[PDB]
Design a protein around this ligand. Structure first.
Ligand SMILES: Nc1ncnc2c1ncn2[C@@H]1O[C@H](COP(=O)(O)OP(=O)(O)OP(=O)(O)O)[C@@H](O)[C@H]1O
Lengths: 119, 62, 47, 49, 394, 105
């Protein structure tokens, strides 16, 4: 987590993303397969975003706080800058039910052609 | 209107001041009494608060 | 001549963590086997 | 053509009820339907092991 | 040995013998209607019983010497007749200079700067180099450092490696003590108690109550309402010089929120300048100067090509200069540079105990340790080598 | 009417210049009764490479704060006359009566 500072897509071999937080900045090689999602979120230098190391669940929280008022009127969220360590590794011991798993495996996912009808 | 002006000025007895203020504040009464002048009356005043945040006495020999 | 032993140690440790992470994620994504796969359906899938 | 489009309203607290990245478990390790059209029987039975 | 060390900052000439003469002497002249014709020298201002309405004949224009007359008289006074003596070998005067110079400012020295006070190793070296030398002396294990010389005219960001000025990556954002003082003057004047005449006592408000806010928007939201803890209503008494000769913020117990002080003093201060003015260093371009802040520049120093040198640079940030001592300045700079710097790199900020005389202490250490037989440029060499030897050594 | 953009830029430049006028900001009389030149000494032959010309920081990345020109508080508004921002209607009035197309500060 952190304010994305720069995207440098290296047929993409990989895309480096710099995430800024109150405790510093870090550069990550970001599995160009999820550059699709990166573009889907329209994220670019300045935004605060999440990304999950397991699947690439990039989530745009909005623009940074310091970039507010760049346009005295603009429909934005301007989420505060994260204060913790950009590298957020923490264990989740939460439990799930077996019927929840069954339901999650009952119907497919995706809108390949008309399968969007599942939403 | 004169009583309203007097209560706004914190007075009980209506005076030419209040009559002038009421006549010149209302849109239609002023149109009706534009030519009229009132004794011991006055024109609408301006506020002096504008002097404070522009210039005042400095610390020089204060 | 500029060198920082602590920085090299931190970089090596984070690189080891990185390799362990990628190995874990690669092993965790291919542990599930399909119920039918793809050749089974293509076989049963008539025109 | 009525311009009186029905216009519901509610706080965003009612929409962020299901978002907590560092508190949700990864269900990708248990899904089976997604593997039907992506993964092959041979890929899992012979090659990967 | 009667050696000497000299700093000629635009705000104040920090000079004196190497025997701990750090005494801080203003580097300009003064005139006032209470002083119709007497043009008081550097420290003669103390003779003025009423320094109200002083006019500053200063030889500096945006940090560069100009008209050469105020400095001439100040030197003839300090080092010529009274406080210090002139001698061809005793006073080992070392001089400070801006980080950029030209043949005319201090290189051409025919009977000027080479006048009767000479010695073997005349040094006209930037104050940044002296500060870096002192730092490395009190920090021997360090290889490089970034000096933040928050002076009157500039706040220079200059890297060093124990001798070497990294000229390729130095920045001097136009914001300085002069701009801060003048902006405070105008802000006070065009809101209440028009006293923008003097770079004087309002300069005291610039030092007595000014502080850098840790959270600017938070202190602002606390200031937008009357009677809160932030004490935006500083209620700074203006000195009339008939009852008091220096202003000061009234204690919190004597606050009159209605401003109707029965003492007769003009106290109607409610605005946020007291912490909005110090904030100009960190986020400029809010007043209009399209420049970067000092943390933004400390980080833009990433332009230093060698990567292995950046983690050594980031650990030796020195916040010297007179303006660096605002309450809350060092920690604010640290917070701003820590988030911008990589998470894996270490950041260590240091603020000298006396960031104004730090350069003078560095000059003292230079004198009393070495630089008498080497790195020398004498008038005898200038007479034989002219401008060449001076620019060669510096 | 409305003022142009040249006037606003000239106002900004002149205010920044006044912010460095040290002798006397408004009225440098205070009594009239080796003489090197001004900053022109080098400002007339500005060199290249590392120097006070290239030593400038440049434009910042953080957007400008919308702060009021009257009281110094946040200003989500902007006056049409000279662009000077203001916080409330009271601020706009105090501005128009002190700064407008006719007056600068
Ligand atoms: N106690 C204090 N609180 C706040 N500010 C202070 C204090 N003491 C000094 N200052 C500020 O420090 C400044 C002095 O800076 P200094 O003289 O070190 O710069 P300089 O060496 O002249 O720089 P240059 O050589 O570029 O002109 C003054 O403008 C003053 O406003």
């Amino acid at each position: 987590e952190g304010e994305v500072t720069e995207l440098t897509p290296c047929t993409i071999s990989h895309v480096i993303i710099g995430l800024k937080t109150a405790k510093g900045t870090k550069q990550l090689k970001l599995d160009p397969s999820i550059f699709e999602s990166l573009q889907k979120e329209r994220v670019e230098a300045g935004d605060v975003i999440y990304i999950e190391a397991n699947s690439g669940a990039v989530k745009r929280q909005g623009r940074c706080d310091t970039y507010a008022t760049e346009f005295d009127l603009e429909a934005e969220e301007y989420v505060p800058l994260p204060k913790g360590d950009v590298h957020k590794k923490k264990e989740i011991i939460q439990d799930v039910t077996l019927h929840d798993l069954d339901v999650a495996n009952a119907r497919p996912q995706g809108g390949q052609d008309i399968l969007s009808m599942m939403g | 209107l004169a009583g309203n002006a007097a209560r706004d000025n914190k007075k009980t007895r209506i005076i030419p001041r209040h009559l002038q203020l009421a006549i010149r504040n209302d849109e239609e009464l002023n149109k009706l009494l534009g030519r009229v002048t009132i004794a011991q009356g006055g024109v609408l005043p301006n506020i002096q608060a504008v002097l404070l945040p522009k210039k005042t006495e400095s610390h020089h020999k204060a | 001549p500029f060198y920082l032993d602590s920085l090299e140690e931190k970089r090596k440790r984070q690189r080891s963590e990185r390799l362990e992470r990628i190995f874990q994620l690669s092993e965790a994504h291919g542990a599930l086997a399909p119920v039918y796969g793809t050749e089974v359906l293509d076989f049963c899938t008539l025109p | 053509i009525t311009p009186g489009i029905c216009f519901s309203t509610a706080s965003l607290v009612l929409r962020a009820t299901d978002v907590h990245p560092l508190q949700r478990i990864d269900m990708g390790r248990f899904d089976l339907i997604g593997l039907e059209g992506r993964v092959s029987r041979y890929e899992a039975d012979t090659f990967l092991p | 040995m009667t050696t000497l060390v000299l700093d000629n900052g635009a705000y104040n000439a920090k000079i004196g013998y190497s025997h701990e003469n750090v005494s801080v002497i203003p580097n300009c002249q003064f005139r006032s209607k209470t002083a119709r014709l007497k043009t008081f020298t550097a420290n003669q201002i103390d003779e003025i019983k009423d320094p109200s309405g002083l006019f500053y004949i200063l030889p500096f224009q945006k940090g560069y010497l100009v008209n050469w007359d105020v400095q001439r008289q100040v030197w003839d006074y300090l080092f010529g007749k009274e406080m210090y003596q002139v001698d061809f070998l005793d006073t080992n005067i070392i001089i400070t200079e801006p980080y950029f110079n030209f043949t005319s400012i201090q290189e051409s020295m025919n009977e000027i700067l080479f006048e009767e006070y000479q010695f073997q190793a005349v040094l006209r070296v930037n104050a940044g180099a002296l500060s870096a030398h002192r730092y490395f002396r009190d920090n021997p294990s360090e290889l490089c450092c970034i000096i933040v010389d928050s002076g009157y005219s500039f706040t220079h960001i200059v890297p060093y490696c124990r001798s070497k000025k990294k000229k390729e990556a130095i920045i001097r954002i136009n914001v300085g003590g002069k701009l801060l003082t003048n902006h405070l003057k105008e802000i006070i004047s065009y809101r209440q108690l028009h006293v923008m005449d003097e770079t004087h006592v309002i300069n005291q408000v610039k030092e007595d109550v000014c502080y850098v806010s840790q959270d600017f928007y938070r202190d602002m939201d606390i200031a937008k309402l009357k009677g809160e803890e932030n004490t935006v209503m500083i209620d700074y008494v203006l000195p009339d010089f008939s009852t008091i000769k220096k202003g000061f913020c009234k204690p919190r117990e004597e606050m009159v929120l209605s401003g109707k002080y029965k003492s007769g003093e003009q106290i109607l201060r409610l605005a946020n300048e007291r912490f909005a003015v110090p904030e100009i260093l960190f986020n400029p371009s809010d007043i209009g100067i399209q420049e970067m802040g000092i943390p933004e520049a400390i980080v833009y120093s990433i332009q230093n090509l060698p990567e292995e040198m950046q983690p050594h640079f980031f650990k030796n940030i020195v916040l010297t200069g007179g303006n660096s001592l605002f309450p809350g300045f060092r920690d604010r700079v640290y917070s701003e540079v820590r988030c911008l710097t990589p998470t894996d790199y270490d950041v260590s900020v240091v603020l000298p105990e006396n960031p104004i005389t730090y350069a003078w202490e560095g000059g003292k250490l230079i004198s009393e340790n070495d630089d008498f037989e080497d790195m020398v440029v004498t008038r005898e060499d200038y007479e034989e080598n002219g401008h060449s030897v001076c620019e060669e050594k510096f | 009417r409305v003022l142009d953009r040249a006037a606003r830029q000239r106002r900004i430049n002149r205010q920044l210049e006044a912010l460095e006028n040290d002798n006397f900001q408004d009225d440098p009389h205070a009594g009239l009764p080796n003489f090197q030149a001004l900053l022109e000494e080098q400002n007339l032959s500005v060199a290249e490479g590392p120097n006070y010309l290239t030593a400038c920081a440049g434009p910042p990345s953080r957007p400008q704060r919308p702060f009021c020109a009257v009281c110094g508080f946040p200003s989500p508004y902007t006056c049409v006359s000279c662009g000077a921002r203001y916080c409330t209607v009271r601020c706009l009035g105090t501005h128009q009566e002190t700064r407008c197309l006719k007056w600068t500060v």
